[PDB]
Design a protein around this nucleic acid. Structure first.
Lengths: 147, 205, 258
RNA sequence: UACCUGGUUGAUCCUGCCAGUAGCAUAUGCUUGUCUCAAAGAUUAAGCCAUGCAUGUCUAAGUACGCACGGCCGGUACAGUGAAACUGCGAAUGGCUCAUUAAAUCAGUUAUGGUUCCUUUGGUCGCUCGUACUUGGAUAACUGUGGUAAUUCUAGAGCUAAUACAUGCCGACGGGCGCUGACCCCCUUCGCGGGGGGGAUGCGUGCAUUUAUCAGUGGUGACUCUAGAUAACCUCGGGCCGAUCGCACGCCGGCGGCGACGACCCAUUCGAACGUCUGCCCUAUCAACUUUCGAUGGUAGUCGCCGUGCCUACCAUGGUGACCACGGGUGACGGGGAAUCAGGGUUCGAUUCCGGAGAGGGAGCCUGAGAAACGGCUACCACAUCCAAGGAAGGCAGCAGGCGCGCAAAUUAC
RNA sequence: UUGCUGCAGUUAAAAAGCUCGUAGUUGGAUCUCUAGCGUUUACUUUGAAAAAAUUAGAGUGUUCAAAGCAGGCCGCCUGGAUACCGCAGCUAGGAAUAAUGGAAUAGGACCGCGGUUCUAUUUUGUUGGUUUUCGGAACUGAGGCCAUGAUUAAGAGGGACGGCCG
C-alpha cells in the first residue's frame, strides 16, 4: 500500500483499527484515528504529523521515542539513508599555549521523521537527545530552519 | 559463551577496536528457544537479579482475543502459516512474536451462539445435533426476547471471517514472546491486516 | 569492581565529619539507611567525636548495645547507622534530646532541644504516587512512606510528623515569602526567605533566597527545605540564626570576645 | 633575584655550539655524634617459587539423647556450659601489581521516560468467598566394618533432628460486586404490545504474571505514566496469601503485651551496567579505509536485566577521511597531582585517594543479589611436585622469605 | 640555542627555478519587546554546580621548626575558616568588536474585506433528527497604505572601450 512497504503489517500500537461499524458510517467514509503526542520543550508538532499516513516507530511525535537530555543543532550534509541523515557540527577548540583556536567538526547520524518532507541539504536543524535507536543514532530531528 | 557486547564490533569510522577487558557475565546470551507445536514442555532459566524466565520448548494451547466485540478464549494452536522475519520458521513450525498462526474456532463460535443465537460456520443443511437447539431456538421471557432482539442489529460479522468459521479455524498473530514469557498469547487477525496477510499467504506459494 | 564496596578510606570520607588524617586509614562507613552516605552522620562520630562520650570504638558499641540511644523514638544498636537532616537523637538515660541541623559553615552541629520538641520532626516530600485501589502515597527525604496524605500536599512541600505515630500533624507549602534552609552546595546551612523560583524545563529549577541581614543568594530546588511559615520557624535554630557573616566580622567577633 | 662566565684570532666584532652554574630524582663512593618525621624488588623478568601464615563465624531467640563436665528431683518431654555436624550468612570487600588498553581507559557535564539491585529504613502482609491443639520421608553428627603407597580421598551397615527437604487446613466469611436469569409486582394499552421494579438456581471474583479492548484519581517540559473499568490467561523445571523460635506472664474454655527469624510486591539506601556532549602522546619511509565472514541505515523477530547489528532473515548502498580517517609505534594504565619556573612554558605522574584492568597464557562454567571469581571449579598450552609407575596434586603481580634478572630495593619478627 | 609572549633565512645554517590553483589562514568604508519574543552565535561580566588529600592561606608557643588539627580559662568559652579548581555543558546582564541574514522575475510588510473543506464540544430545563453562529486552521478573488523596497562607488579587484608601446 502507500504506507505498506514491508513483509510485516505497519500500524501504530496504541491505535485499534477493527471497531464494529454500522453501514451508515462504513459506506460514508474510511479514516483510521492518527495518534500523536506533544514533546515538552516548547516544540509545536508539525501539521503533516497529525494529518499524515506515514508509520514510523522512531518518530518523536508519532512513535515510542521520549525526548530527554541535550538539545543541539547541526547542518545537513548527507540525506542518503532511510529516514536518517548525517549532520555536521562545527566548533573552535581553544589552545592556551598559543592563546589561539582551531576549528573542528563532528558528523553524527540523526533520525529524520518522514513528516519533515521537502527538506534540502545545507539548512540548519535542531535535534533532541533520545534513547539509542541504532548502533550510531542517539539524536532525533525536532525542527528545521531554512538557509 | 554467547556475548551481546558492543566492543567486538568495528567503530562507526570503520577501524578495528582492541578489547581492554575479556567477556563479563552480564554480557552473556543463551541459545534460541526454537518453540515447536506440541504438548506443553516449558523449562525455566535463572537470570540476573535471581529472577526466573520461562523458556517454552513446545507449546500446544494459548489464549487469543476477539477485539471487535472484546472476548478472549483459551484455544489449541493448529499450525504456523506465515512469518514476516524469515521463511525457514514457516517450514520448521517455530512460534515467535508477530508470526501468523491458524488456531481452532470452537470457543468463539460457542460464545457467539450463547451470546446472540445466530449460526456461524454452519452450512445450509447440517442437522442440529441435540444440544445446540436449547441455545439457537430456546424459549425465554419476553424481556430477554426483546433484550436479544436489540442485540440482533449489532451482531453482523465481516465476510472475511465467515469462510474461516465455515472451515472451523481462525488466522491469529502472536503478541507474547513464548521464549521469554513462556506462553503463546496474541489476537485473531481482522479487517485490513487480515486481507494483507491473506494475499501475502496466497502469494507465498 | 565486582559487587558493592564494604570499606571507606579515611581521607575519602565527607569533609563535614572533620576526621583527622593520623588516627587511622579507614573511616566509619555509614551503613545503608534513610539518608545518603555523603549527607548522613554515623552514631560512632556523633558519640565519640562530637559529644566526647566514648574515647575508642569499643566504648561506642558498649554504649549502643545497652540500648540507651533512640533515633526518632526507635532504639538503634548499629553504631554506623546514618542519622541525617531533621533526625532527633534521644538519650533517655541522661534525658538529652538533639536535632541534627546544619550550622552556618556547613556541618551537623551539636544543637540540643527541649524534650517537648523531641516529639515531632519536619520532612520534605520527594514524590507523591498512588497505587492499588488508589490509596495515594507520599515519600519524604528520610524515606518515610506514609499512606493517605492530605491532598493539599504537593511535591517539594514540607510535612510535620509526630515521631510516636507515623501521621502528618501539619504541612507548609513551597511558595514565595517562606523561611527555607539550604541542604547542598556552597550555601549549605544558610537560613533565609524565598523571593522567587525560575523554572527551567528539562533542567534544574533555580530559586533566589534573601537572608535576614539583606544578603541575597541563589540555589538549586533540590537543595531547599522549607522550615517556617512566612518568616517564623516551626523548629529551634542553631547557635547562630543561619546568618552567613563573612571572615572580616568573623575575625572582628573573635577579637571582640578576646 | 626577570642574572650569566671560559673556549675559534696575532689581536677585533659577530653567528654558533661545547664547557662551567643552581634545582630535582635513581645509583654509587668516602664519611657518619644527638633527636623528630619518613620512602623502600616500580624500571631489567606481569620471570620462577621451598616453607609458614593471610576468611572465617552463635545470640535469651533454627537443629543438643557426645556423661566431655558436675547439678538438681528423683515417675517431672527439654536444668545449664558445650565439642562435633546439619542449617543461615560471608568468602565478589580488603590487599597486590601496571602486562594490556590511543575516543579505549579516564575527567568534567547530563540521561535511564530504557534496567537490575543482597542489605538497611519505611509501606504492605485475615482486601482472595474456596491433622489445624501441628502432616510426610530421608540424611549427617555418633557407633561399627573397610579399601589405597598416596590427598582437607571416601564406599558399605545401624539409629536420630529442623527456620534443611517436602506436603497442606480451618478462620476472615456475613456478604458485596460484575454476568446468566425460570418466576412475581406496577402503569399505560379493550387487547396485541411498550415501559419501570424484585428474584432462586449456575458462572467468575484479591495482589503478582501474559495478551486484547473501553474511559479519562494524581503527576510530568513531554508517556504507550500512575490508578480505574471489561473479557480472559496463570508455566508440575509450580508466585504471595507464616505448620518456626526466645523472655515475661495475666483477664472473664477462649482472648492478649514485648521482641526475633521469615515474606510476593512498591518506595529508599549502597551501588552496578549501558549510554550524551567536550577533551590525549609520536608517526605520511601509513592516503584512502570499512562492506565475501556486519560495514552504515530500514522492517520483523531472536537473545539479553533492558535500548541497540548484540545476533538471524529479507531489503537499501551506505558510514569515516588532509578540520589527518585507516594503519603502525609507544622505555602509555587514565585522572586528583609532582619537579622546575619572571610572564609564557617544559618535563614527570608504576607508587598510599578516585576510576580501570589481571592473577603464568588463553577459553568455558557452577553457586549467588553480586564473579565469566582464580587463597572456586573444568579443559588445553608452557613449566613443575610426589609415586609402590597403578594414579595423585599445582598457581606469591597478598605478608615474610628464597632463586633469577640487574646499576637498582628491608624481618621466614610481635 | 624551538622563539605564542620571543628567534632566524644578501654574505655566518637557511627563500621552492618560475607561475597557476583546491583545502587551510586572513580580508576595505558604511546601518542611533509584546504566557510567547528579539536574527542566531563568538566575546565579556555575574550566578549554581563542581570529593578529599595536595597547593595558596586564616586561627593555634609541636619547647621552636618540618608538622599536627588541635586547644585555651577558674565544670566552662572555642576551632576544625577561606581562596583557586583549565576546557566544555547549564544561568542572567552588556551589545563596542568579529561572522550571518531579514523585501529584487515582489508568492514583500501592515490593515480591514468574498467564498471551499473541517472542527469547538457552551446553546434552545434534561433527551433523539436537521440547520447555525461564536471559539480555531490551510486555500484563495480583489482593495487601501508603506516618504513602498537596491548605502556608497575603495589611491581593492575583474571586465569594456580609445590611441599608442615593446
Amino acid at each position: 500500500a502507500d504506507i505498506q512497504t514491508e513483509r510485516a503489517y505497519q500500524k501504530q500500537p496504541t491505535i485499534f483499527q477493527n471497531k464494529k461499524r454500522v453501514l451508515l458510517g462504513e459506506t460514508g467514509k474510511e479514516k483510521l484515528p492518527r495518534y500523536y503526542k506533544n514533546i515538552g520543550l516548547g516544540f509545536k508538532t508539525p501539521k503533516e504529523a497529525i494529518e499524515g499516513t506515514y508509520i514510523d516507530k522512531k518518530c518523536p511525535f508519532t512513535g515510542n521515542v521520549s525526548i530527554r537530555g541535550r538539545i543541539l543543532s547541526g547542518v545537513v550534509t548527507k540525506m542518503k539513508m532511510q529516514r536518517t541523515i548525517v549532520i555536521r557540527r562545527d566548533y573552535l577548540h581553544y589552545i592556551r599555549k598559543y592563546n589561539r583556536f582551531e576549528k573542528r567538526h563532528k558528523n553524527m547520524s540523526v533520525h529524520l521523521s518522514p513528516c519533515f518532507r521537502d527538506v534540502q541539504i545545507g539548512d540548519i536543524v535542531t535535534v533532541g537527545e533520545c534513547r539509542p535507536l541504532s548502533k550510531t543514532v542517539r539524536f532525533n530531528v525536532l525542527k528545521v530552519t531554512k538557509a | 559463551g554467547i556475548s551481546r557486547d558492543n566492543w567486538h564490533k568495528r567503530r562507526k569510522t570503520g577501524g578495528k577496536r582492541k578489547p581492554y577487558h575479556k567477556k563479563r557475565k552480564y554480557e552473556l546470551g543463551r541459545p534460541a528457544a526454537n518453540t515447536k507445536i506440541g504438548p506443553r514442555r516449558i523449562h525455566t532459566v535463572r537470570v540476573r537479579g535471581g529472577n526466573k524466565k520461562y523458556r517454552a520448548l513446545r507449546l500446544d494451547v494459548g489464549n487469543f482475543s476477539w477485539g471487535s466485540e472484546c472476548c478472549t478464549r483459551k484455544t489449541r494452536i493448529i499450525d504456523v502459516v506465515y512469518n514476516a522475519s524469515n521463511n525457514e520458521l514457516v517450514r520448521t513450525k517455530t512460534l515467535v512474536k508477530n508470526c501468523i498462526v491458524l488456531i481452532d474456532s470452537t470457543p468463539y463460535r460457542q460464545w457467539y451462539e450463547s451470546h446472540y443465537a445466530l449460526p456461524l460456520g454452519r452450512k445450509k443443511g447440517a442437522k442440529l445435533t441435540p444440544e445446540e437447539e436449547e441455545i439457537l431456538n430456546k424459549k425465554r421471557s419476553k424481556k430477554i426476547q426483546k433484550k436479544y432482539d436489540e442485540r440482533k442489529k449489532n451482531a453482523k460479522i465481516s465476510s472475511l471471517l465467515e469462510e474461516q468459521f465455515q472451515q472451523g479455524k481462525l488466522l491469529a498473530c502472536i503478541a507474547s514472546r513464548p521464549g521469554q514469557c513462556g506462553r503463546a498469547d496474541g489476537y485473531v487477525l481482522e479487517g485490513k491486516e487480515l486481507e494483507f496477510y491473506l494475499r501475502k499467504i496466497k502469494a507465498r506459494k | 569492581a565486582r559487587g558493592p564496596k564494604k570499606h571507606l578510606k579515611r581521607v575519602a570520607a565527607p569533609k563535614h565529619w572533620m576526621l583527622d588524617k593520623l588516627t587511622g586509614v579507614f573511616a566509619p562507613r555509614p551503613s545503608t539507611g534513610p539518608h545518603k552516605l555523603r549527607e548522613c552522620l554515623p552514631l560512632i562520630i556523633f558519640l565519640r567525636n562530637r559529644l566526647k562520650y566514648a574515647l575508642t570504638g569499643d566504648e561506642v558499641k558498649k554504649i549502643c548495645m545497652q540500648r540507651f540511644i533512640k533515633i526518632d523514638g526507635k532504639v538503634r544498636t548499629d553504631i554506623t547507622y546514618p542519622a541525617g537532616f531533621m533526625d532527633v537523637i534521644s538519650i533517655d538515660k541522661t534525658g538529652e534530646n538533639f536535632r541534627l541541623i546544619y550550622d552556618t559553615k556547613g556541618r551537623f552541629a551539636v544543637h540540643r532541644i527541649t524534650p517537648e520538641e523531641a516529639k515531632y520532626k519536619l520532612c520534605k516530600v520527594r514524590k507523591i504516587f498512588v497505587g492499588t485501589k488508589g490509596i495515594p502515597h507520599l515519600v519524604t527525604h528520610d524515606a518515610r512512606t506514609i499512606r493517605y496524605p492530605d491532598p493539599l500536599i504537593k511535591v517539594n512541600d514540607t510535612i510535620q510528623i509526630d515521631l510516636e505515630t507515623g501521621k502528618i500533624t501539619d504541612f507548609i507549602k513551597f511558595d514565595t515569602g517562606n523561611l527555607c534552609m539550604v541542604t547542598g552546595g556552597a550555601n549549605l546551612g544558610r537560613i533565609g526567605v524565598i523571593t522567587n523560583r525560575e523554572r527551567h524545563p528539562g533542567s534544574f529549577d533555580v530559586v533566589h533566597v534573601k537572608d535576614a541581614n539583606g544578603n541575597s543568594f541563589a540555589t538549586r530546588l533540590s537543595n531547599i527545605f522549607v522550615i517556617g511559615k512566612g518568616n517564623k520557624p516551626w523548629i529551634s535554630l542553631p547557635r547562630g540564626k543561619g546568618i552567613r557573616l563573612t571572615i572580616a566580622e568573623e575575625r572582628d567577633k573573635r577579637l571582640a570576645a578576646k
